[PDB]
């Protein structure tokens, strides 16, 4: 606690230097059953010192399952959140997660998990919708925010992520700040909108992706802050996965579709704001757009990667707006070697603003997200495997697909199992879990083709999806199911969206019993 | 032929008097396969003269099924649309309907129907999404709009409904105007927002329910208008249905919930803008709020009834915003006997503005919709019976429920069949069709109780719904299903949202085969 000169340089508020404490000194503040808030998004910008001290305290005193907290984070946290689920330190989690231990604990009943739209989770938290049973007029007992610098008025300058930090600071009884001295200051990128509750809300004055407010810090009450912890740990982001030829085919289909749209005037020659994120398909789509001679692109998304940095360097992309930027150490070197140019080409916003239906619908964003499965009537599954197993959470996909001008979903046509190389079909008679309904989807893309579902009736949607996106091994099965359902509905005068509820989930049951969705025969229907 | 003096009084644009034509004179303009746009909403304000002329022409020349149009209307049309479906004059319909012949034709495959969010249908129509196969650079061949008066610049002053009339006028090749001289002029209560497409969109400057723009007419190109038809036929609105004791119990539960919310400060003493429309339950809820001593209420909905007029008279309600006003002839007399006091407390907007996620989320609207069925995991069905039979269309329920501060769904706990007085259960193991997901719904209300689903995991949601909203005849069945699914999921480590896909739709299959959802036993699961 020899207040390192780096720490003195980062924090410019004199009273805050009297609230400096080590991570292990904050242990008595935390008690069982408390509601905790974390800054961060998709694993970047999350606090590390205080969670590590808490884990060490739990290990030392053998408090596994006896010292647990209701953890609220803006999005998925880093490996620190995994180690809480491994030690049973979480009672409830919301609204997103990426860890494997977290998913295993949730699916084993050890953790209660509910996922929610990323634009509405902090907003509904500010309404007190999630802390109803509290009787002491509080919402969050503590918020733990990672900062890179502190302004002269005591405000907090976030790191590579904003997330729900403004709302968390708003509705927290006490605030704990980690000043990360191992990463250079991110001052100047953030455009932070402090939440205002109705009926006192005003329109967002943003007309473009680069319109700002001038507020690059989170105003926090200096009396609320109880501790300033110096953090020297850098974010751990896995290296990106190179795109494979299933992703390149998807990207080529999407690029041809975009050229056709621009040719007909339905999109401008510079396209519209895009929201592309993490995944092999997203990188492949970005590369295909880069190689398609598209210029002056704009991005209004949740997360950026190293992929968009190449666009910045080669000039295909003009400006980018995201809740968080998620890039590796070589990305750190590339960006900070060109800090001045990087600053003027990226703006970091809160997840309530980035995923807001207002901005997405006003800007005409083009949405591209990956489903677990899409049935023949364009209802998409994003969270549950076979309707029960949580994978990651809904995230911002639901916010972006309903509001976007173009709602595009890209997925592999089929996935392998232990018995059949094409044992799982992305196109099914009926999705076991519906997250994005048929009223949100516009374009469905697989490695087999592109289905244009705009202005189509359910039977037309089914025929188009089976023809274009369905794998050749499942086209016959899906066509037979649709024909039988159409005959049955003609018998029973329900031919709008024909179905056989007796046979609807037979792919999933057949996968469970035999290891492959390829059904030998359907059960007869009267 | 002579032009009516009343028509002279209503139309104030001199050139338009040279385009006055009888309804039967516009027959040659209409051809098979054309895209037609109609003004109107929920059956009020729709054109009548031209559709009746078309029906008479089809009857005279026996053109049933040979003269058909792609009909696009803002919402459900009146009885005129029923006679069109009865003669097979519709190829495609969107995005909402209420007629019984229309649903019969759609479910028999005679009409292709796709439903869409009411805030997005005119927008996506202006983008050319639904006229993708046209090669002549058009969108709508004709827009048929009913008017009550015409301003001095040739603009249209709508009637009791706005709907998608601005967008339809924007994207129409030619415009046909019916000046309804049988109804008094509705001038002054309209707030028309002319559509602007990205990237040229600006925020809506509305902060309150009564914030206006000053544009009370729809601007049209005077050269686009080809005919002015005099209409003397009034809207045929059915009398309202008195509330019954299942709806009064629902209203009492909702009133107690609102009192509790105001007591805890989660709602202001004057509440927030409400979204209540047609139906016995909506009238019951309005009456319950009136008798609950709530004052200075505000309404931001789609449709008003004659019920809200009582609130206007007794002072419980201050201002109301809706796309259309749908009230009976006695209501017409009551409102226009006090036209000055009724003009100053109602504003009619376009359905793109009324159902916009931006305004709904900014104003903190309280949404109240009626689902067909809700499963134990809060996925609500609003359109399809048993997953196939179209009832009415999604409408604006999806727009309000996701964006509203409070998302409330109220439905009867059970419905009778020919064999069992409680043969249909609104609470089912799994919904055969998902329109509103678990990420949108907050409150579920039946005549048995109120389920508060804010911040609950799927198993907690299931327990709460079965305890509060499930009918006593189905509580045992739902509890047994949930327990078996929980055991099965514990066996295979999918305990987040446990399900038995083999038994998920057994309620509906048992209803089909035996006439009641009360299943004797479940199929075993390994």
| Resolution in angstrom units | 3.0
Kindly list the distances between the CA atom of residue A225 and the CA atoms of A6, A72, A169, in Å, as whole numbers in the listed order: 20, 19, 10
* Nearest-CB residue to A490 (from B109, B460, B495): B109
Rounded to whole angstroms, the Cα distance separating B229 from B176 reads 8
Neighbours of B181 (CB within 10 A): 21
Known binding residues of B: 277-281, 392, 396
CA–CA separation, A491 vs A494, rounded Å? 8
Q: How many whole angstroms separate alpha carbon B408 and alpha carbon B17? A: 50
CA–CA distances in Å: residue A78 to residues A34, A97, A349: 21, 9, 20
The full DSSP string for B392-447 is S--TTHHHHHHHSSEEEEE--SEE--SS-TT-EESEESS-SS-SB-TTT--EEE-S
Pairing status of strand A443-445 against strand A406-410: parallel
Q: Which two tokens stand for residue A407?
A: 């709602």
Please answer yes or no on whether B130 and A454 come within 8 Å at the CB atom: yes
Instruction: Quote the CA–CA distance of B437 and B457 in Å, as a whole number.
Output: 14
Method in brief: cryo-EM
- CB A314, CB A335: distance < 8 Å: no
DSSP 3-state assignment of B315?
Answer: coil
CA-nearest of B23, B125, B138 to B74 is B125
Cβ of residue A435 closer than 8 Å to a chain B Cβ: yes
Q: How far is A108 from chain B (nearest CA, A)?
A: 5
| φ, ψ for residue A416, nearest 5 deg | -80, 160
Give whole-number Cα distances, B245 to A373, B252, B256, B330, B417, in Å: 43, 10, 16, 26, 19
Terminus-to-terminus CA distance in chain B, angstroms?
A: 81
CA-nearest residue to A260 within chain B is B132
Residue B344 backbone dihedrals phi, psi, to 5 degrees: -85, 0
What does the angle CA B386 – CA B380 – CA B390 come to, to the nearest 5 degrees?
40
Quick count: other Cβ atoms within 10 Å of Cβ B315?
10
Cβ neighbours, 10 Å, residue A182 = 13
Yes or no: say if B489 and A389 are a contact pair by the CB < 8 Å rule. Answer: no
Q: CB of B488 within 8 A of CB of A389?
A: no
Strands (E), A49-132: 69-73, 90-94, 112-113
* CA proximity to B399, closest of B174, B179, B122, B169: B122
What tokens appear for B507 in the block?
A: 């309620």
Question: Is the Cβ pair B388, A494 closer than 8 Å?
Answer: yes
| CA B100 distance to own-chain centroid | 16
DSSP for residue A505: T
Beta bridge partners of A69: A90
Residues of B in Cβ contact (< 8 Å) with A96: none
Closest CA to A423 of A477, A482, A502, A503: A477
By the 8 A CB rule, do A199 and A225 touch? no
Q: What is the dihedral of CA A509, A512, A515, A519, to 10 degrees?
A: -10
Bridge partners of residue A373, in order along the sequence? A381
Q: Are B415 and B424 in contact (CB under 8 A)?
A: yes
Residues 383-402 of B with CB under 8 A from A: 384-390, 394, 398, 402
CATH of the domain at A135: 3.40.1080.10
Instruction: Using CA coordinates, name the residue in chain A closest to B513.
Output: A526
Name chain B contacts of A452, Cβ cutoff 8 Å.
132
B437·A398 Cβ contact <8 A? yes
| A-B contacts (CB, under 8 Å) | 229
What is the rounded CA–CA span in Å between residue A306 and residue A311? 9
Q: Cis (ω within 30 of 0) for the bond into B115?
A: no
Are A44 and A324 in contact, with CB atoms under 8 Å apart? Answer: yes
- The residues near B106 (Cβ < 8 Å, ≥ 6 apart) are A496, B85, B93, B97, B112, B113, B390
Q: In this complex, which of A112, A362, A501 lies closest to B387 when CB atoms are compared?
A: A501
**Phi and psi, residue B36, nearest 5°:** -115, 140
Residue with tokens 């927290």: A172
Classify residue A202 as exposed, middle or buried by CB count within 10 Å of its CB (0-12, 13-18, 19+). Answer: exposed
| Residues of A assigned a catalytic role | 302
Shortest CA gap B505–chain A (Å): 6
B167 forms bridges with which residues in the sheet?
none
For chain A, the first-to-last Cα distance in angstroms comes to 78
Separation in Å, CA of A210 to nearest CA in chain B? 13
Tokens of B224: 């686009």
**B434 and A CB contact within 8 Å:** yes
Which among A132, A198, A494 has the least Cβ separation from residue B405? A198
Provide the edge-to-edge strand list for the sheet that holds A90-94: A112-113, A90-94, A69-73, A35-38, A140-147, A172-180, A225-231
User: By the CB < 8 Å criterion, does B452 face chain A?
Assistant: yes
**Is the Cβ of B517 closer than 8 Å to some Cβ of chain A?**
no
Q: Which residues of B touch A498 (CB under 8 A)?
A: 388
Q: Give the residue from chain A lying closest to B204, CA to CA.
A: A203
Instruction: Name which of A199, A353, A405 to mutate to probe chain B: the one with the most chain B Cβ atoms within 10 A of its Cβ.
Output: A199
- The DSSP bridge partners found for residue A319 are A298
Binding residues of B for CoA: 277-281, 392, 396
Q: Which two tokens stand for residue A2?
A: 């020899």
Domain containing A217 equals 5-231
Per the CB < 8 A criterion, the answer to whether A386 and A432 are in contact is: yes
Longest dimension (CA), chain A: 82
Partner-chain contact A439 B130, CB within 8 Å? no
- Establish whether the linkage from the previous residue to A95 is cis, with ω within 30° of 0: yes
B496 close contact with A: CB closer than 8 A: yes
Say which DSSP state A249 is in.
H
3-state secondary structure of A277: coil
For residue A381, give both structure tokens.
Answer: 């599954």
Dist. CA A217–CA A169, nearest whole Å: 12
> Under an 8 A CB cutoff, do A112 and B457 touch?
yes
Query: Are B89 and B32 in contact, with CB atoms under 8 Å apart?
Result: no
Chain A nearest-CA distance from B182, in A, is 36
Q: What are phi and psi of B5, to 5 degrees?
A: -65, -40
Structure tokens at A252: 């080529």
Out of B81, B167, B287, B302, pick the active-site residue. B302
The C-alpha of B39 sits at a distance from chain A's nearest C-alpha, in angstroms, of 20
Pairing of strands B274-275, B366-369: parallel
Angle at A17 between CA A14 and CA A21, to 5 degrees: 160
Give which of B130, B307, B145 is closest to B220, Cα–Cα: B145
> Residue B122 is inside which H or E element, if any?
helix B121-126
A414-415 and B427-428 strand pairing: unpaired
Structure tokens at A484: 């039988």
Name the DSSP class of A432. Answer: S
| Shortest distance, CA B238 to any CA of chain A (angstroms) | 27
Give the separation between CA A166 and CA A191, rounded to whole angstroms: 11
**8 Å CB contact between B120 and A437:** no
Cβ burial of A484 (10 Å; 0-12, 13-18, 19+) is middle
Considering only CA atoms, which of B30, B404, B203 is closest in space to residue A204? B203
Taking only residues 170 to 189 of chain A, the set having a beta carbon closer than 8 angstroms to any beta carbon of chain B reads: none
Are B127 and B159 in contact by the 8 Å Cβ rule? The answer is no
Residue A35 CB neighbour total at 10 angstroms: 23
3 state SS of B349: strand
Tokens of A131: 């802390």
Sort A266 into a burial class: Cβ within 10 Å, 0-12 / 13-18 / 19+: middle
Given a contact cutoff of 8 angstroms between Cβ atoms, the answer to whether B94 and B118 are in contact is no
Eight-state DSSP code of residue A436: B
Number of other residues whose CB lies within 10 A of the CB of residue B233 = 16
Beta bridge partners, A44, equal A41
Give the Cα separation of B458 and B452 in Å (integer).
Answer: 13
- Crossing angle of helices B458-468/B472-492, nearest 10°? 160
Q: Is A349 on the interface with B (CB under 8 A)?
A: no
- List the single residue in A207, A357, A457 with the smallest CB-CB distance to B113: A457
- Pick the residue from chain B with its C-alpha nearest to A396: B439
CB contacts, 8 Å: A525 with chain B: none
Our CA angle for A439, A442, A445, nearest 5°, is 130
């Amino acid at each position: 606690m020899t207040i390192s000169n780096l720490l003195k340089q980062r924090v410019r508020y004199a009273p805050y230097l009297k609230k400096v404490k080590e991570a292990h000194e904050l242990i008595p503040l935390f008690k069982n059953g408390q509601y905790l808030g974390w800054s961060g998004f998709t694993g970047v910008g999350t606090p590390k010192a205080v969670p590590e001290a808490l884990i060490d305290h739990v290990e030392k005193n053998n408090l596994q399952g006896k010292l647990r907290f209701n953890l609220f984070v803006g999005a998925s946290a880093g490996p620190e959140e995994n180690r809480w689920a491994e030690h049973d330190m979480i009672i409830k989690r919301a609204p997103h997660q990426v860890g494997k231990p977290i998913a295993k604990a949730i699916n084993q009943g050890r953790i209660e998990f509910f996922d929610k739209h990323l634009s509405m989770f902090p907003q509904d938290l500010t309404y007190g919708f999630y802390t109803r049973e509290r009787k002491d007029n509080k919402i969050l007992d503590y918020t733990i925010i990672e900062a890179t610098a502190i302004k002269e008025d005591g405000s907090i300058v976030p790191g590579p992520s904003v997330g729900g930090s403004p709302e968390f600071i708003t509705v927290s009884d006490k605030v704990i700040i980690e000043v990360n001295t191992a990463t250079p200051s991110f001052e100047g990128i953030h455009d932070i909108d402090m939440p205002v509750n109705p009926p006192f809300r005003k329109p967002y004055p943003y007309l473009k992706v680069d319109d700002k407010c001038g507020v690059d810090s989170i105003p926090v009450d200096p009396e609320k802050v109880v501790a300033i912890v110096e953090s020297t740990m850098r974010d751990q982001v896995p290296p990106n996965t190179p795109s494979d030829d299933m992703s390149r085919a998807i990207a080529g289909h999407l690029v041809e579709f975009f050229r056709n749209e621009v040719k007909h005037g339905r999109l401008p020659e510079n396209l519209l704001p895009l929201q592309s994120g993490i995944g092999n398909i997203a990188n492949a789509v970005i590369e295909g757009l880069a190689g398609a001679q598209f210029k002056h692109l704009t991005v209004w998304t949740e997360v950026l990667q190293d992929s968009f940095l190449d666009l910045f360097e080669n000039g295909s992309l003009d400006y980018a707006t995201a809740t968080s930027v998620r890039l590796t150490e070589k990305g750190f070197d590339r960006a900070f070697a060109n800090w001045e140019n990087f600053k003027h080409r990226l703006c970091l916003r809160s997840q309530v603003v980035s995923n807001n239906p207002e901005m997405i619908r006003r800007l005409g964003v083009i949405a591209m997200n990956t489903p677990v499965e899409v049935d023949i009537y364009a209802h998409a599954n994003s969270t549950n495997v076979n309707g029960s197993r949580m994978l990651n959470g809904l995230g911002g996909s639901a916010d972006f697909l309903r509001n976007a001008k173009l709602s595009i979903m890209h997925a592999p046509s089929a996935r392998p199992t232990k018995v059949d190389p094409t044992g799982i079909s992305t196109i099914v008679p009926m999705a076991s879990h519906v997250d994005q309904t048929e009223h949100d989807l516009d374009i469905l893309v697989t490695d087999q083709g592109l289905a244009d579902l705009r202005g189509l009736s359910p039977k037309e949607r089914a025929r188009e999806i089976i023809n274009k996106c369905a794998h050749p091994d499942y086209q016959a099965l899906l066509t037979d199911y649709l024909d039988r359902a159409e005959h049955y509905a003609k018998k029973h005068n329900c031919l709008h969206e024909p179905h056989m509820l007796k046979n609807a989930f037979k792919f999933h049951t057949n996968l469970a019993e035999k290891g492959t969705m390829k059904v030998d025969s359907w059960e007869p229907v009267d």
